[PDB]
Amino acid sequence: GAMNSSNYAELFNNDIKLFVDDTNVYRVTVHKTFEGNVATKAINGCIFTLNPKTGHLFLKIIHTSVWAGQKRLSQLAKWKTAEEVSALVRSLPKEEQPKQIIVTRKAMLDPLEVHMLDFPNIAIRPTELRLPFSAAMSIDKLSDVVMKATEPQMVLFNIYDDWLDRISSYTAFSRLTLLLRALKTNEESAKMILLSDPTITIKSYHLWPSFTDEQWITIESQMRDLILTEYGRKYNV
Amino acid sequence: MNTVPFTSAPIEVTIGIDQYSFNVKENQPFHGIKDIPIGHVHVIHFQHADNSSMRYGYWFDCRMGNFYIQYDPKDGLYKMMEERDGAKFENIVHNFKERQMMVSYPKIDEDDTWYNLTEFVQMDKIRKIVRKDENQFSYVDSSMTTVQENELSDPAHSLNYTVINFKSREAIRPGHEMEDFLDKSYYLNTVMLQGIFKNSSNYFGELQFAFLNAMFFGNYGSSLQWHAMIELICSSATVPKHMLDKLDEILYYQIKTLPEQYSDILLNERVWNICLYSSFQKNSLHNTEKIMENKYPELL
Numbered sequence: 001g002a003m004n005s006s007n008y009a010e011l012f013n014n015d016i017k018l019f020v021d022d023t024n025v026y027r028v029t030v031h032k033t034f035e036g037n038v039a040t041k042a043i044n045g046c047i048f049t050l051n052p053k054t055g056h057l058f059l060k061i062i063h064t065s066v067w068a069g070q071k072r073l074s075q076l077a078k079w080k081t082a083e084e085v086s087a088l089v090r091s092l093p094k095e096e097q098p099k100q101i102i103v104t105r106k107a108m109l110d111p112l113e114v115h116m117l118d119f120p121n122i123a124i125r126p127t128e129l130r131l132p133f134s135a136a137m138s139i140d141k142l143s144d145v146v147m148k149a150t151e152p153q154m155v156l157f158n159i160y161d162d163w164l165d166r167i168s169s170y171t172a173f174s175r176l177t178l179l180l181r182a183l184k185t186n187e188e189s190a191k192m193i194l195l196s197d198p199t200i201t202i203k204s205y206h207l208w209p210s211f212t213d214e215q216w217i218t219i220e221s222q223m224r225d226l227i228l229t230e231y232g233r234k235y236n237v
Numbered sequence: 238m239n240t241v242p243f244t245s246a247p248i249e250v251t252i253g254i255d256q257y258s259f260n261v262k263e264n265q266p267f268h269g270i271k272d273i274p275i276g277h278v279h280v281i282h283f284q285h286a287d288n289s290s291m292r293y294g295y296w297f298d299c300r301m302g303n304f305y306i307q308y309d310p311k312d313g314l315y316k317m318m319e320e321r322d323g324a325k326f327e328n329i330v331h332n333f334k335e336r337q338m339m340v341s342y343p344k345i346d347e348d349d350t351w352y353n354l355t356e357f358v359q360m361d362k363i364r365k366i367v368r369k370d371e372n373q374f375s376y377v378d379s380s381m382t383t384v385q386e387n388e389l390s391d392p393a394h395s396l397n398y399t400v401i402n403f404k405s406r407e408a409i410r411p412g413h414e415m416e417d418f419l420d421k422s423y424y425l426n427t428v429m430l431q432g433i434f435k436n437s438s439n440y441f442g443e444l445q446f447a448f449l450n451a452m453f454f455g456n457y458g459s460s461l462q463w464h465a466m467i468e469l470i471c472s473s474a475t476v477p478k479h480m481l482d483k484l485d486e487i488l489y490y491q492i493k494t495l496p497e498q499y500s501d502i503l504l505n506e507r508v509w510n511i512c513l514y515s516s517f518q519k520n521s522l523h524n525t526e527k528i529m530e531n532k533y534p535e536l537l
């Protein structure tokens with residue numbers, strides 16, 4: 001059924017699974033035309049396909065060329081997402097194919113079920129969790145790779161860096177969701193907290209700074225404060 | 238001109254003949270139904286007074302043999318039987334008619350309702366959906382499951398309706414996933430019409446039979462089938478103009494005939510709202526849209 005706070009530990013068991021977030025696939029800038037009408041200009045997007053156990057992020061870059069001469073782009077974006085996820089599964093050896101794919105938005109269920117008819121044993125699941133994967137494009141290196149792409153590409157990142165050498169998947173996923181929740185709520189504040197101390201760098205192939213365990217504790221605390229700081233404003237609570 | 242005699246009526250029962258029904262009392266001197274119109278299939282149906290969890294009946298065509306009803310006190314139901322001896326049968330019917338122990342099939346001359354509900358329904362097709370090849374008539378009841386329902390459990394007692402599944406390899410061509418899912422024309426026209434049914438008449442026949450089994454027996458699987466065959470047409474951008482026009486007439490008479498108080502359980506809100514207001518054919522079913530809006534505006 002649906003993934004929720006009740007069945008949360010399932011994400012970290014030994015059944016291969018992927019989360020699929022499609023919220024950055026179809027991206028536009030809205031602008032005025034010379035005649036004072038409004039038009040959109042598509043910019044490059046991405047599919048966020050994450051193994052929450054290993055941290056493997058299959059970032060499929062969606063180049064604006066996909067959209068050329070197509071209608072109903074917000075509908076097509078769901079089907080292109082399902083097409084690319086099904087292509088990714090087909091590309092993997094049997095023993096690496098997921099047993100479940102969890103979609104962050106219910107509108108992805110039918111497109112993905114239909115594209116995955118050839119895989120009746122792969123469970124396509126929604127979730128009641130409000131995951132902050134939409135903020136993926138606030139991670140500088142992910143944003144950079146997407147915006148620079150001149151053709152369809154698909155880059156594999158480890159969104160946990162080398163955290164799994166020191167912490168469990170459960171803990172790494174909690175850290176990732178706190179960072180993304182922070183970036184989503186107030187990107188400027190979040191980025192300031194992460195990049196304030198120039199002595200702490202980001203490794204060439206990492207996404208996040210090389211915090212010591214004790215420095216992660218301070219960072220995680222500052223991220224919580226930010227999410228509360230901003231929450232007492234949204235709701236005047 | 239076409240009589241179904243009854244041996245007797247030992248148990249109190251509501252008897253239906255097509256869209257008509259009457260009450261028979263325990264041991265009432267009732268010896269059957271006369272003046273049944275030749276040229277159509279018919280259904281004789283039963284609901285015992287003592288147990289309404291017992292709703293069942295027989296599809297038959299009087300052109301295919303001499304049929305009678307006789308209560309079986311062992312199996313506890315009214316059973317259809319064929320009399321092979323023409324003269325014993327003629328002698329039984331003549332006697333019961335002389336003693337006026339039969340009800341008359343009470344057709345209004347102006348009234349084409351039964352023709353309109355059974356136009357494409359053929360006994361030969363009924364006998365493929367309901368398999369019991371040793372009889373010329375077909376038993377259906379409220380509890381009988383469809384082959385499709387049996388997939389998701391006695392095959393001999395099943396309704397063999399054509400399996401329709403929108404999220405199936407049958408319905409979706411590789412490389413046309415979004416196209417075939419959003420516009421079901423391929424599935425309707427190539428897979429179902431050209432491939433399985435051969436023609437729109439056989440498709441309409443199964444649609445009409447499913448509706449009638451839903452209405453007369455509250456057969457749930459039949460209701461699912463009727464809605465699936467509507468939805469497949471309404472979800473197809475490319476349908477022959479003759480098929481849309483005929484579908485509008487078919488559905489009009491089915492909505493007209495449906496008891497007012499059963500709309501809640503026999504009509505699927507989602508399918509009808511999609512078919513009349515969102516689908517490719519939202520502007521193609523004028524008669525159906527008008528009777529639905531005037532008879533069941535709550536559902537919509």
Ligand SMILES: COc1cc(CN2[C@@H](c3ccnc(OC)c3)N[C@@H](c3ccnc(OC)c3)[C@@H]2c2ccnc(OC)c2)ccn1
Pocket residue numbers: 141145154155156157158204205206207
């Ligand atoms: C299809 O995957 C890729 C990946 C890259 C290149 N990545 C990177 C990546 C990271 C940061 N910026 C990038 O800006 C394009 C790309 N992810 C790497 C990675 C990390 C961990 N586990 C990994 O796998 C288990 C992979 C990998 C890489 C490249 C160069 N040096 C590396 O190690 C010294 C690692 C380039 C092209 N395609």
